Amino acid sequence: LLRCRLPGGVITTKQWQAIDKFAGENTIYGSIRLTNRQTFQFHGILPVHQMLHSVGLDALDMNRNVLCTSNPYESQLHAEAYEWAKKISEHLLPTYLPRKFKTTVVIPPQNDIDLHANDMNFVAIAENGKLVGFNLLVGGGLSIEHGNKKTYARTASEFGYLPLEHTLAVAEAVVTTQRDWGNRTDRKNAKTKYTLERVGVETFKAEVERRAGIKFEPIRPYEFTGRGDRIGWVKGIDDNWHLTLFIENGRILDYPARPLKTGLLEIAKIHKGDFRITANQNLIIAGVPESEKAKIEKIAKESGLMNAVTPQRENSMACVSFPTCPLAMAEAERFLPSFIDNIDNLMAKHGVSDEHIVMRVTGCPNGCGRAMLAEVGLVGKAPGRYNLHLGGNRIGTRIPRMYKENITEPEILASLDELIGRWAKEREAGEGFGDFTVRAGIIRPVLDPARDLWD
Ligand code: SRM
Ligand code: SF4
Ligand SMILES: O=N[O-]
Ligand code: NA
């Protein structure tokens, strides 16, 4: 189990060839696994620090990888936002945190980084194509304990707006308040989401302003329209293009007839710019001169990196789980493909094959696969059994309530077949499945997680 500090998921082609070699000759699995926190993992490491440090990479400290929207519609905004994600990352590097701390830099209208699963969030605010500040959202966290109503997933709370110059002092202030006010006794209550609920958002906020040496201004408008990656070619700035490759489960391995790993090595060798690991476990070959599109595209196409999948598969995600995770209760990564094969059939059957439902499977309640922010979330309870949650939304600002408990795939399928059926026929124009289950009364919404997540 090795993981890199790779703020924003940006990794160079030189660094890629380095992790490609190691994965292939120094691990049991021989794969590169892209995670949903924009970094990679090796599985079955049989020194890695030298191999990493040589290409200017390092393994992480309760601070996890700082995320940054990978492919903003306003392509010019990435450079600055990424610069800030990298600054915050080095600035937060070693104080001890009671529990781990997760941070992101979001570029609206995209919430691909899933900000509500994190402790500290900086929503970029730009004027005239220039970043002028950030709206600070604090307190997200998805981890729960089965049957423990004292634990809960919570969404981030808005603190206010801050000029760009106050970024680092604000980041440090949230970290330190949390550290000092974190529950000293129990670790399962040491998360920021718990502290906020204990002391209150305004109380925590006031302390943060006090320590930062600032006063938050009112939140500046921002909205999100989605969380998915922009699969395929999208036009960037100047004459450059970005090809985002869909990688199922983010598992990069050479499969028979689908040399995904070799393909990425090949592309890495001729690629101008760099790669960007997305929060959806995909990979962006970034900054391809228009003149190179055909080269890059030929390789990706031949390697099976560009095989078309349904929009459903592109918006589905699962955590690692078995065989490498020790906390795994049920399959996640290894269950998703055939499970989505079934969901695909179901989407076809109802005439919604062009639609998608943000569907996630987390191997255990720790919540790594972010099922607690999905429209349809599966939380492993035991081998082959999951709790089925429903009612989240496409943009990821609502926690889905438990709908069915400790059920098997055949039972999960039967339930979705019926629900998807009702959605395909009764939904309003452009209405997502999640919002639909809530509107149709299939599931009560979770309006205040700390108080109404559990029935
Ligand atoms: C790889 C990944 C899932 C995936 O398929 O993408 C994953 C994998 C693991 N996570 Fe995670 N988590 C992953 C994203 C997250 C997320 C989602 C996110 O951050 O966007 C969450 C939910 C949000 C949250 O933290 O509230 C998450 C919450 C946890 C927790 C529960 C934390 C808590 O507050 O209780 C644990 C267990 C722990 O550390 O307490 C954990 C533990 C683990 C470990 C490291 C198991 C361990 O403790 O030894 C898992 C390693 C499995 C393996 O064999 O590789 N992981 N984990 C992601 C790696 C992130 C990274 O590179 O830093
Ligand atoms: S959610 Fe559970 S099973 Fe999945 S990777 Fe995280 S700790 Fe392991
Ligand atoms: O890697 N789990 O936070
Ligand atoms: Na993926």
Side-chain angles (χ1 to χ4, degrees), residues 1-2 15-32 40-52 261:
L1 179 281
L2 184 70
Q15 295 174 328
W16 187 269
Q17 294 168 21
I19 76 180
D20 175 88
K21 182 196 189 60
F22 183 90
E25 62 188 36
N26 295 185
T27 71
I28 293 167
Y29 294 90
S31 64
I32 294 175
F40 60 90
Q41 291 189 162
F42 293 125
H43 283 115
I45 297 183
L46 271 2
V48 297
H49 288 282
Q50 292 181 339
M51 175 286 273
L52 295 168
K261 196 169 169 293

Side-chain angles (χ1 to χ4, degrees), residues 245-449:
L245 301 170
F246 165 76
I247 304 186
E248 202 173 22
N249 287 314
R251 186 72 65 172
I252 294 169
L253 180 74
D254 275 2
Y255 294 106
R258 287 187 318 136
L260 309 183
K261 196 169 169 293
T262 292
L264 294 178
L265 184 62
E266 285 305 283
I267 293 172
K269 298 191 300 184
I270 72 181
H271 184 49
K272 298 301 175 190
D274 34 49
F275 297 166
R276 298 186 188 160
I277 299 168
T278 83
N280 290 296
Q281 302 158 347
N282 289 313
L283 195 65
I284 305 169
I285 296 145
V288 184
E290 181 153 20
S291 39
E292 307 301 304
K293 293 184 59 180
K295 276 181 199 289
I296 297 301
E297 186 177 305
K298 206 204 201 66
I299 296 175
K301 220 108 182 181
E302 294 189 346
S303 304
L305 287 158
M306 291 184 70
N307 279 354
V309 293
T310 60
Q312 182 52 56
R313 194 164 310 250
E314 292 175 355
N315 293 94
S316 292
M317 185 171 73
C319 70
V320 173
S321 188
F322 297 120
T324 55
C325 191
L327 311 177
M329 301 176 148
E331 296 285 358
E333 158 160 351
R334 307 195 301 192
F335 159 81
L336 198 71
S338 53
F339 174 63
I340 297 306
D341 284 339
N342 278 295
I343 297 293
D344 276 341
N345 289 331
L346 293 177
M347 295 290 261
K349 171 182 173 180
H350 294 284
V352 289
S353 53
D354 294 308
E355 281 297 346
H356 70 264
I357 298 167
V358 178
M359 196 171 281
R360 306 166 162 180
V361 180
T362 193
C364 86
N366 282 325
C368 306
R370 304 202 293 257
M372 291 302 283
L373 282 176
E375 292 181 281
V376 176
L378 264 61
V379 188
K381 202 180 157 61
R385 316 193 79 94
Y386 306 81
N387 285 344
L388 181 58
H389 292 245
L390 296 181
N393 56 25
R394 285 186 166 172
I395 56 168
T397 56
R398 202 167 61 221
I399 307 282
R401 178 181 302 281
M402 183 164 74
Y403 172 70
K404 281 193 174 192
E405 186 184 1
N406 210 4
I407 60 179
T408 62
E409 184 186 40
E411 306 168 57
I412 289 166
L413 256 11
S415 310
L416 295 179
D417 186 357
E418 190 210 328
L419 299 168
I420 286 169
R422 291 192 52 182
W423 172 65
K425 292 199 240 169
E426 307 164 42
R427 67 148 164 165
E428 294 191 320
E431 185 179 41
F433 179 86
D435 288 317
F436 175 63
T437 59
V438 171
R439 175 180 70 82
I442 297 158
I443 193 71
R444 283 274 190 190
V446 174
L447 307 174
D448 189 358

Side-chain angles (χ1 to χ4, degrees), residues 1 3 33-37 39 41 43 64-65 67 99-100 102 113 117-118 140-143 191 193 281 318-321 324-327 366-370:
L1 179 281
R3 184 195 301 142
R33 173 60 154 64
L34 305 174
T35 77
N36 61 13
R37 277 202 82 74
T39 187
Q41 291 189 162
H43 283 115
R64 300 314 239 203
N65 203 42
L67 316 188
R99 213 74 174 71
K100 53 189 178 185
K102 296 172 165 189
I113 49 85
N118 301 257
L142 303 185
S143 216
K191 194 71 170 165
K193 57 177 166 176
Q281 302 158 347
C319 70
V320 173
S321 188
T324 55
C325 191
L327 311 177
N366 282 325
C368 306
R370 304 202 293 257

Side-chain angles (χ1 to χ4, degrees), residues 35-264:
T35 77
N36 61 13
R37 277 202 82 74
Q38 306 182 324
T39 187
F40 60 90
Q41 291 189 162
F42 293 125
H43 283 115
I45 297 183
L46 271 2
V48 297
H49 288 282
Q50 292 181 339
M51 175 286 273
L52 295 168
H53 156 280
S54 57
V55 295
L57 242 31
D58 69 325
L60 284 160
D61 178 65
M62 290 285 109
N63 239 257
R64 300 314 239 203
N65 203 42
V66 179
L67 316 188
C68 187
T69 300
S70 322
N71 201 357
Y73 289 115
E74 223 191 302
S75 304
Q76 73 267 22
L77 285 181
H78 189 260
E80 293 190 74
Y82 165 61
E83 186 187 305
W84 278 103
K86 182 182 164 293
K87 272 160 160 180
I88 288 157
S89 183
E90 293 157 332
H91 180 66
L92 293 187
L93 237 40
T95 65
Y96 178 64
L97 299 157
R99 213 74 174 71
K100 53 189 178 185
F101 211 82
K102 296 172 165 189
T103 307
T104 69
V105 182
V106 210
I107 305 179
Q110 293 170 119
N111 184 28
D112 57 328
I113 49 85
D114 242 334
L115 84 101
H116 293 288
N118 301 257
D119 295 281
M120 193 166 56
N121 307 278
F122 292 94
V123 179
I125 294 302
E127 289 177 334
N128 304 129
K130 113 194 79 71
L131 228 55
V132 295
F134 295 113
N135 279 332
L136 176 67
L137 276 71
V138 171
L142 303 185
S143 216
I144 61 168
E145 223 170 88
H146 283 314
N148 189 348
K149 302 187 179 179
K150 275 181 292 175
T151 67
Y152 47 75
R154 193 201 190 262
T155 47
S157 290
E158 290 175 356
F159 270 30
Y161 171 91
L162 59 295
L164 210 49
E165 62 204 275
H166 298 320
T167 303
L168 296 190
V170 168
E172 199 178 80
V174 166
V175 165
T176 62
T177 304
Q178 153 59 16
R179 168 208 69 185
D180 293 341
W181 300 3
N183 194 309
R184 302 285 53 170
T185 326
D186 185 33
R187 145 149 296 203
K188 317 173 167 187
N189 191 258
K191 194 71 170 165
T192 317
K193 57 177 166 176
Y194 293 127
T195 311
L196 276 193
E197 293 288 348
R198 206 187 77 238
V199 309
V201 181
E202 304 302 331
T203 306
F204 200 110
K205 173 177 168 177
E207 188 58 20
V208 164
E209 294 176 321
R210 198 193 68 82
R211 307 199 182 190
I214 74 164
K215 251 217 165 178
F216 291 98
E217 294 180 33
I219 285 292
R220 292 197 183 172
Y222 74 98
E223 67 187 6
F224 295 114
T225 50
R227 293 185 278 182
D229 288 341
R230 297 164 69 203
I231 303 303
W233 290 107
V234 303
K235 182 173 195 129
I237 55 179
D238 305 331
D239 63 306
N240 297 184
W241 296 70
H242 302 309
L243 172 68
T244 300
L245 301 170
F246 165 76
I247 304 186
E248 202 173 22
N249 287 314
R251 186 72 65 172
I252 294 169
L253 180 74
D254 275 2
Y255 294 106
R258 287 187 318 136
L260 309 183
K261 196 169 169 293
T262 292
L264 294 178

